[PDB]
Amino acid sequence: IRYSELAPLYDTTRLYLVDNKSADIASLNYQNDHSNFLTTVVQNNDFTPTEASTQTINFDERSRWGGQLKTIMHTNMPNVNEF
Amino acid sequence: MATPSMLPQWAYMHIAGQDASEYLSPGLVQFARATDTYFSLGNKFRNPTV
Amino acid sequence: NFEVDPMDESTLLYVVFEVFDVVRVHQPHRGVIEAVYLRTPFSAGNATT
Amino acid sequence: DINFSSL
Amino acid sequence: WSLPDMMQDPVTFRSTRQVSNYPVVGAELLPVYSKSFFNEQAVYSQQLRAFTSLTHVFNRFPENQILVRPPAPTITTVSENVPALTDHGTLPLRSSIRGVQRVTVTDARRRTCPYVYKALGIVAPRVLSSRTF
Amino acid sequence: APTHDVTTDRSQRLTLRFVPVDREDNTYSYKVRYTLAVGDNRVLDMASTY
């Protein structure tokens, strides 16, 4: 199966890493800036977020699986900087 | 069998079913007893208690 | 639902939920080590790295 | 309650 | 982009929690770009920054008539911040994925980047090719 | 006592130490990587590590 608290899904499926968790995962970030941030991939609507950051998304070894990375980045920086 | 959770994995993670004197090959059982007092294998295999 | 005595200090309530935490470490080959992890009432592991 | 072993 | 513990890394990399080195994924542009603009009164608008600021510590006291601030470029380059969106190929995932997973962006000097306020990971798992179950 | 089958008479190190192969310095942590090598025909218990 692909999860034990939801029905298994087959073929293409989505996952998300969202930087909008800053109070559901920000007790793990107190020295992690936004470029090193920890954030949940589990996004259970009807489960408490605190107790749902330790859940696991299973993938069967029927086939190899590989994610398709996509990144949306917006930076605001000045042109005189330490960078 | 490794990626599944649920129903099969109770057996294979040893929270029920066979002892660790029944789940091991019968020559590794012999090795364990004979070398018990020099190099214990006691904490390396878990015996379910149900 | 717990009932506790009042205390001036802010306090926490630590509830331990006793489960089964079981890891099974397999080495198929040399220089290769793997583990399957299981936690049952609160689901976890299965080689989750 | 509590699982541990001796073999 | 790097997501070191959430997937197997491309060839010629290995997982490191050491801060000095990390995997590379993507290898894409910084979202800072330059947009040219044109002013034909560029040289004449330094008489209107002279008007505004009578201070002349920007327009400066003439030290010698070579040693003076220069008239402005007619064509200038102006900083522009617009998001960059990018899609990439398949990166093989871990057998199971942790509930919380690290996301890290690192520059060409291989160190963490100030001045980033949105970096959004989107990963879509899909079958690649059969292996024994 | 047993005679052989619990004792090697070859050169065998009973204790080793391993220096870091990388290290990090950070304001809240120090990190150290090692290469722990287990030789051929010897098994390491991980209750002996410190």
> Is D3 an 8 Å CB contact of chain C?
yes
How close C26 gets to chain E, by Cα (Å)? 15
Q: Which chain E residues are closer than 8 Å to C46 by Cβ? A: 95-96
Q: What gap in Å lies between CA E60 and CA F41, rounded to an integer?
A: 80
Determination technique for this PDB entry?
A: cryo-EM
Residues 6+ apart with CB under 8 A from A58: A1, A2, A3, A4, B3, B4, B5, C46, E96
- Which residue spans within chain F are E strands per DSSP? 22-25, 30-33
CA distance to B26, E28, E29, E41, per residue, from E108 (Å): 57, 10, 11, 39
Q: Which chain D residues are closer than 8 Å to C20 by Cβ? A: 3
List the beta bridge partners of residue E79.
Answer: E34
- D3 contacts C20? CB cut-off 8 A: yes
Q: How far apart are the first and last CA of chain E?
A: 31
How close A56 gets to chain C, by Cα (Å)? 5
Rg (CA), chain C: 19
Q: What gap in Å lies between CA E78 and CA E89, rounded to an integer?
A: 33
User: Which residue on chain A is closest to C38 by alpha carbon?
Assistant: A56
User: Within 13 A of E93's CA, how many CA atoms are on the CB side?
Assistant: 27
User: Which residue on chain A is closest to E26 by alpha carbon?
Assistant: A69
Q: Which among F47, F44, F28 has a CA at the least distance from the CA of F36?
A: F44
Beta-carbon count within 10 A of B46 CB: 19
> Is E98 an 8 Å CB contact of chain C?
yes
CA dihedral B27, B32, B37, B40 (to 10 degrees): 150
**Helix, strand, coil distribution of chain B in percent, nearest 5:** 20, 0, 80
Contact E79, E37 (CB under 8 A): no
Q: Which two tokens stand for residue A75?
A: 């930076």
Q: Which chain B residues are closer than 8 Å to A59 by Cβ? A: 3
Contact E76, E42 (CB under 8 A): yes
Q: Is the dihedral of CA A79, E103, A7, A23 positive or negative?
A: negative
B and D interact (at least 3 Cβ pairs within 8 A): yes
**Interface test with chain B among A61, A62, A63, A65, by most B beta carbons within 10 Å:** A61
Residues 6+ apart with CB under 8 A from C22: B13, B14, B15, B46, C37, C38, C39
User: Which residue on chain E is closest to B5 by alpha carbon?
Assistant: E96
How close C34 gets to chain A, by Cα (Å)? 15
Residue E51 is given by DSSP the state H
Q: Which chain D residues are closer than 8 Å to C18 by Cβ? A: 1-2
